[PDB]
């Protein structure tokens, strides 16, 4: 009836997908990106580099670690890991091999029936 | 205001964040006092000192004799003995830490005399 009136707002940029990509105690390959950030919320530590956009990227294969770079700051490091395999007696290992066995035995019965 | 000792320590930290001692290229740092020189060779990864050469060593204190402070000729002797002390250990490459002081002067003579033979830097 009466009317209305527009606004001087409406603009906004889309999410640039910042934040942590790889967390602590998780594998990271050489050249893999751990953090995509604007400033040095996290500093670079050992076995790790820094880019133009303050992008922290790994140089070796290992696990990520977060330390404190002084009283009120934090950094990132990538130390090598161990090479301990899994035992065959694990619930995961016994179950994993169970599929391989049932998949082959069920196959053997398919062509072996007739 | 700031004193000579305070500004010296600041000049040494800005250098240390670039140079880093390693097993393949240890860190050679120098400390000059008002009456003595002093040198260390460190593998920063191990936090251990491999070699050293001071003004208070017997093999050189009997040789040189200064009244006020160590001269440029003294630095040439420190760079000589430390080199022979390094080659026996089985290391040639090294990173030169100038201890925050300017390169010009006695620090240059210590580096050149040490660079004169044996070492690679």
């Amino acid at each position: 009836k009466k009317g209305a009136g527009s606004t001087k707002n409406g603009r906004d940029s889309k999410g640039q997908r910042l934040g942590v990509k790889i967390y602590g105690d998780q594998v990271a390959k050489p050249g893999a990106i751990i953090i995509r950030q604007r400033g040095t919320k996290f500093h670079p530590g050992k076995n790790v580099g820094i880019g133009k956009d303050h992008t922290i990227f790994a140089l070796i294969d290992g696990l990520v670690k977060f330390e404190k770079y002084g009283p009120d700051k934090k950094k990132v490091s990538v130390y090598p890991r161990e090479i301990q395999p899994e035992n065959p007696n694990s619930y995961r290992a016994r179950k994993r091999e169970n599929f391989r066995l049932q998949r082959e035995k069920k196959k053997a019965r398919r062509e072996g029936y007739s | 205001a700031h004193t000579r000792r305070e500004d010296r320590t600041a000049r040494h930290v800005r250098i240390r964040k670039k140079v880093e001692g390693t097993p393949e290229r240890p860190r050679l740092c120098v400390f000059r006092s008002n009456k003595h020189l002093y040198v260390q060779v460190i593998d920063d990864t191990k936090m251990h000192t491999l070699a050293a050469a001071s003004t208070m060593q017997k093999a050189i204190s009997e040789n040189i004799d200064y009244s006020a402070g160590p001269t440029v000729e003294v630095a040439q002797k420190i760079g000589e003995m430390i080199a022979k002390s390094c080659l026996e250990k089985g290391i040639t490459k090294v990173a030169f830490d100038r201890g925050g002081y300017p390169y010009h002067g006695r620090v240059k003579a210590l580096a050149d005399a040490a660079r004169e033979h044996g070492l690679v830097f």
Partner: protein
Amino acid sequence: ATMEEVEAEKSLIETNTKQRMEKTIETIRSNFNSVRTNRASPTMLDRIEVEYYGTPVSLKSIAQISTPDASSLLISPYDKSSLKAIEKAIVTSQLGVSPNNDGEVIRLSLPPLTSDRRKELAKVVSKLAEEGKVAVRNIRRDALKSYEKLEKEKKLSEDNVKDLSADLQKLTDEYMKKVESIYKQKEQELM
């Protein structure tokens, strides 16, 4: 036609009205007091001047004005030589009153209200109210043009003008009620 532009164009035009409405209501009240419906007169004798030793001076400085009754007036001249000069000025002013004298002072006597006078006088009271309403309607008439001039110049929308114009009439209509209210209390004074 952003909102910041509508507020500015509203603020400019509206303040010219309100600052102009107050001028009318102030002057319209003065038009009523000039009718002089014999209520009380500390004010009528103020504009009459007299000659005192070659100096045109107001009556207020030469004598005192005391109103012992609503339908009369007393003048207490400090100088007897100035008493006759007061009688001359009142008659030459042609106010419509016959001053008298008791040898010491001058007494006026406002006449009573007649039927022929009340009707001819009431016609003047209504006429001044008409001159007040047209003064307001000219302001409503001037304000709406400016909204239309901004519209032709493509600085406002058709939607904005209908809102401001409809909202502007509410402002003027408030001031219109002040015209009747001053007219209602005045019509009671005729009796």
